[PDB]
Amino acid sequence: KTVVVTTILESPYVMMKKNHEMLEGNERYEGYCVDLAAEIAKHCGFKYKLTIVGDGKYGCRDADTKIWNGMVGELVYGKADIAIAPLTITLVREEVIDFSKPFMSLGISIMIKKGTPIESAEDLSKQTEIAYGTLDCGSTKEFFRRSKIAVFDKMWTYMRSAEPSVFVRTTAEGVARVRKSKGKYAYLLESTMNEYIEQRKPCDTMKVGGNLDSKGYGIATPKGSSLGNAVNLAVLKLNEQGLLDKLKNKWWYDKGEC
Amino acid sequence: KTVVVTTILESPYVMMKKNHEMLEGNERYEGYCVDLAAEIAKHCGFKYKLTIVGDGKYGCRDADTKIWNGMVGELVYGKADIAIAPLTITLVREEVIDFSKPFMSLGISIMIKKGTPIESAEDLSKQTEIAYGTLDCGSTKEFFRRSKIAVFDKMWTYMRSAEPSVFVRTTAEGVARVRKSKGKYAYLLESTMNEYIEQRKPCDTMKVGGNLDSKGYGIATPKGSSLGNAVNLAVLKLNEQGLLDKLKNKWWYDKGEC
Numbered sequence: 001k002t003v004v005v006t007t008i009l010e011s012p013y014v015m016m017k018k019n020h021e022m023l024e025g026n027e028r029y030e031g032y033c034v035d036l037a038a039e040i041a042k043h044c045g046f047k048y049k050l051t052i053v054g055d056g057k058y059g060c061r062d063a064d065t066k067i068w069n070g071m072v073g074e075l076v077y078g079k080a081d082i083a084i085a086p087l088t089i090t091l092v093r094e095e096v097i098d099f100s101k102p103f104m105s106l107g108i109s110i111m112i113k114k115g116t117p118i119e120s121a122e123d124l125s126k127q128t129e130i131a132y133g134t135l136d137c138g139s140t141k142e143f144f145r146r147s148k149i150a151v152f153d154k155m156w157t158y159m160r161s162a163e164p165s166v167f168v169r170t171t172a173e174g175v176a177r178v179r180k181s182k183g184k185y186a187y188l189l190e191s192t193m194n195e196y197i198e199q200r201k202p203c204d205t206m207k208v209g210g211n212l213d214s215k216g217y218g219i220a221t222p223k224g225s226s227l228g229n230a231v232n233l234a235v236l237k238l239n240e241q242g243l244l245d246k247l248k249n250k251w252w253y254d255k256g257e258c
Numbered sequence: 259k260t261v262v263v264t265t266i267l268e269s270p271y272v273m274m275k276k277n278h279e280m281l282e283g284n285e286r287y288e289g290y291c292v293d294l295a296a297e298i299a300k301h302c303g304f305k306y307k308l309t310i311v312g313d314g315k316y317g318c319r320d321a322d323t324k325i326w327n328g329m330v331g332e333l334v335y336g337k338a339d340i341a342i343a344p345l346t347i348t349l350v351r352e353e354v355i356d357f358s359k360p361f362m363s364l365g366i367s368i369m370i371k372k373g374t375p376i377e378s379a380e381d382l383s384k385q386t387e388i389a390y391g392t393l394d395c396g397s398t399k400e401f402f403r404r405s406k407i408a409v410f411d412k413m414w415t416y417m418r419s420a421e422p423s424v425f426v427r428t429t430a431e432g433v434a435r436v437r438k439s440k441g442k443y444a445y446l447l448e449s450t451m452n453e454y455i456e457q458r459k460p461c462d463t464m465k466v467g468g469n470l471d472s473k474g475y476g477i478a479t480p481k482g483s484s485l486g487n488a489v490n491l492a493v494l495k496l497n498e499q500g501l502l503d504k505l506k507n508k509w510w511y512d513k514g515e516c
């Protein structure tokens with residue numbers, strides 16, 4: 001049985017190869033998660049097909065219908081066998097899908113245009129001149145909506161009611177708004193993407209302050225799927241043999257532009 | 259049924275309170291893991307007894323008999339229900355017991371006596387006037403034995419053969435040895451422990467370099483135990499509410515002596 005893998009286009013995790021239109025199947029793609037997928041499959045002994053998630057989303061649960069969208073949904077509704085992506089391990093997801101132990105550590109972080117007078121979340125919350133927001137339908141937004149810590153709740157209260165919207169649809173959309181906003185927009189996003197963008201031309205953004213929380217990405221499978229045990233052991237083996245650090249270097253730093 | 263918890267005396271995870279001899283049961287102890295346990299029991303709704311592991315070990319498998327010792331053994335052989343301790347999630351353990359998602363991140367790091375001329379593992383591996391070692395029967399020693407990375411493999415050869423032994427039975431033993439070696443012993447240990455000790459009188463040690471690897475501590479239960487699911491969901495909730503972060507501030511930095 002060819003394992004159906006859901007994933008999403010997000011640099012440097014999964015990206016289209018330059019000559020993708022001349023290539024077929026799995027060969028169309030490259031990146032951290034493409035390399036990780038090849039290694040998981042070889043170590044667990046399965047054949048697989050990478051498929052980009054149809055709605056371009058990670059997965060949130062619609063309040064009204066309570067239907068799950070994105071990669072989480074593809075797993076919940078039986079459309080995919082496994083998701084290999086920068087999918088954040090969270091409580092509400094773990095209630096509907098299974099995760100491996102994390103293959104990468106991260107935290108929510110602040111991205112500014114260089115020179116923006118902000119050094120922390122506390123700084124953002126006590127001022128109004130510089131706008132700030134997060135991605136829609138992700139763990140970052142849910143972290144702010146749920147948090148009971150004063151600084152973060154105060155930030156949430158601001159963001160939910162800010163007009164125009166401070167929320168963006170895609171990482172690229174948030175980074176353009178930082179760049180294009182002359183220092184008047186700050187972007188809350190995971191440290192891993194922040195670090196990657198900081199190493200890319202035009203070299204005008206930077207991560208400031210410490211991370212706001214601490215969590216991980218995991219490989220997800222449908223609840224009670226039998227693939228989960230093998231996949232979990234593989235991730236731990238690969239971490240032990242240093243493959244995950246090798247890959248992070250390859251995709252983030254070995255070719256940093258800054 | 260009262261849940262039996264195996265743990266181990268290791269600062270600042272589990273320590274006897276100054277007035278323990280006046281106190282009874284779970285009240286004799288305090289620390290990060292003591293607070294963590296009360297939180298897990300509360301959210302999973304259970305009553306528990308904290309018991310210090312008889313042999314004072316975390317857990318490794320005897321090569322001849324294949325028998326597991328320490329906290330891992332207590333779980334495997336049916337003597338405890340759960341382990342709450344700085345127990346490293348590793349491949350070999352995950353084969354015989356279950357772990358929650360990590361409640362704390364860490365890496366292998368180098369502890370030196372302030373002033374020692376060492377900046378990295380490379381630096382250790384390329385000289386021999388400074389001795390260095392690790393704890394017996396833990397995940398750090400196994401890391402160096404199993405490591406196919408040139409530098410880490412190189413150190414392993416030196417360490418296994420060295421005489422006298424560069425290995426230690428306890429964290430305290432390693433730390434003392436550093437402190438009295440007048441700079442000619444460096445100790446390889448987990449970053450969490452390193453950081454804690456750095457903030458304690460007589461403030462003569464420091465962590466140097468970045469971490470050699472990235473891993474996590476997890477709460478362990480016997481394979482296929484029912485407690486596993488709730489405990490896991492409980493670790494994610496606590497992390498999400500910032501409690502794990504509050505606890506680490508409480509126990510590492512809030513009362514630092516340096």
Ligand SMILES: C=C(C)[C@H]1CN[C@H](C(=O)O)[C@H]1CC(=O)O
Pocket residue numbers: 010058059086087088089134135136137138139140141171188189190
């Ligand atoms: C890039 C997308 C929106 C994903 C990536 N990890 C989080 C997800 O697993 O929800 C999202 C990041 C964001 O929430 O800051």
Ligand SMILES: C=C(C)[C@H]1CN[C@H](C(=O)O)[C@H]1CC(=O)O
Pocket residue numbers: 268316317344345346347392393394395396397398399429446447448
């Ligand atoms: C302090 C003890 C021996 C433990 C704690 N974590 C690892 C354990 O879970 O194996 C060990 C540290 C390391 O081996 O340096």
Ligand SMILES: [Zn+2]
Pocket residue numbers: 016020
């Ligand atoms: Zn294209």
Ligand SMILES: [Zn+2]
Pocket residue numbers: 039042043
């Ligand atoms: Zn391999």
Ligand SMILES: [Zn+2]
Pocket residue numbers: 278279
């Ligand atoms: Zn006593």
Ligand SMILES: [Zn+2]
Pocket residue numbers: 297300301501
């Ligand atoms: Zn609580």
